[PDB]
Structures are given as C-alpha cells and as structure tokens.
C-alpha cells in the first residue's frame, strides 16, 4: 500500500531478504550509483547498548544493479511502530 498506480515498471528483483539478526544491533549499508549501476553493500554488527560506538569494522558488498536513472534525493522509509 506504500505506492499507488504502478506504471511502466522497468526493473525488478526478488531474493532472500536483506535484514538478518538485549543489545541494539547496528547494520551497515552503502548506497551508491555509478554510471547507471546501483551498488549495495552490507554488514552486521552487535553494539552494546545515543552515539556511534568508537571502534572499527569493514563493510562487504552484496550486489550491483543497473537501474540507470538520474538520482538527486533519497527518502528512508520506516514503520509507524
């Protein structure tokens, strides 16, 4: 119900879902578009107990997709509760 009147859909993809699993758990993504290719990374980190905890980790990539559209803004979606 998030969208309405889906029209001339030019790309789709379905696979195993992204978000796997006391401590608030932190998950690391990078969203980046290069010459039409939309690159998606991933990483998961358990974090004890706001602030970003001073530490170091690395992010693996997941998949890249050639959406090939012009992007200038982004709006992160979230649930009510």
């Amino acid at each position: 119900r998030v969208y309405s009147s889906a029209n001339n859909c030019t790309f789709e993809y379905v696979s195993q879902p992204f978000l796997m699993d006391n401590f608030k758990n932190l998950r690391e993504f990078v969203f980046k578009n290069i010459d039409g290719y939309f690159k998606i990374y991933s990483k998961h980190t358990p974090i004890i107990v706001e602030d970003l905890p001073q530490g170091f980790s690395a992010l693996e990539p997941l998949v890249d997709l050639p959406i090939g559209i012009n992007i200038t803004r982004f709006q992160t979606l979230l649930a009510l509760h």
Binding site: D35, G36, Y37, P66, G68, I69, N70
Partner: peptide
C-alpha cells in the same frame, strides 16, 4: 513513426542514462 528521437534538451545525458521528442521519417 513508431520510433522517435530527441535533439533539444537542457543538458547532455549521463552515461547509461535513459531519459523518457521528434520522429524519423524512415522511407
């Protein structure tokens, strides 16, 4: 006339960018 093309636009396109205009008279 099922094929059309563009020759007027504000700026040039991006690599691998599909911007969605006049038609060719293919005879």
């Amino acid at each position: 006339y099922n094929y059309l093309y563009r020759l007027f636009r504000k700026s040039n396109l991006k690599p691998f960018e599909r911007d969605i205009l006049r038609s060719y008279s293919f005879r």
